[PDB]
Amino acid sequence: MSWMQNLKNYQHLRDPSEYMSQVYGDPLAYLQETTKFVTEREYYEDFGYGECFNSTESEVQCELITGEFDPKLLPYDKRLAWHFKEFCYKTSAHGIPMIGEAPLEHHHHHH
């Protein structure tokens, strides 16, 4: 699984694999990250709750940690830190469950 970090640790190539290892759920998530690398309407509009805010079967427990979301092993740029960590490795769930602007906009989820 360490290959996931090995790709996402740096941005030298346009290979989608770096972002396919970033997000494990809905294609739209790492699709927008592949074309942008930064926040986007669709990137947090259909998202908000799940492994990486996604609506797919939780398998690696991103709500706490996966073993690939280790802060010591993943380099953090300003844009990387905000988008990557908050979307995937965010453990909290407050009034803003999105990457940025969420005026009481909570995506459907179950407790």
Number of domains in the chain: 1
Residue 75 lies in domain: 1-111
Dump the DSSP string for 59-110.
-S-TTT--SS--TTTS---HHHIIIIIIIII-----S--SSS--SS-PPP--
Method used to determine the 3D structure: NMR
Q: Is 34 helix (H, G, I), strand (E, B) or coil?
A: helix
At CA 48, angle to CA 47 and CA 49, rounded to 5?
110
Torsion from C-alpha of 87, 91, 96, 102, nearest 10 degrees: 20
Looking at residue 9, the DSSP 8-state letter turns out to be T
Residues ≥6 apart with Cβ < 8 Å to 107: 46, 47, 48, 49, 50, 53, 55, 97
Helix, strand, coil shares of the chain, percent, nearest 5, are: 35, 0, 65
Tokens of 37: 């690398």
Rg (CA), the chain: 13
Residues with Cβ within 8 Å of 62's Cβ and at least 6 positions away in sequence, in order, are 24, 51, 52, 69, 88, 89
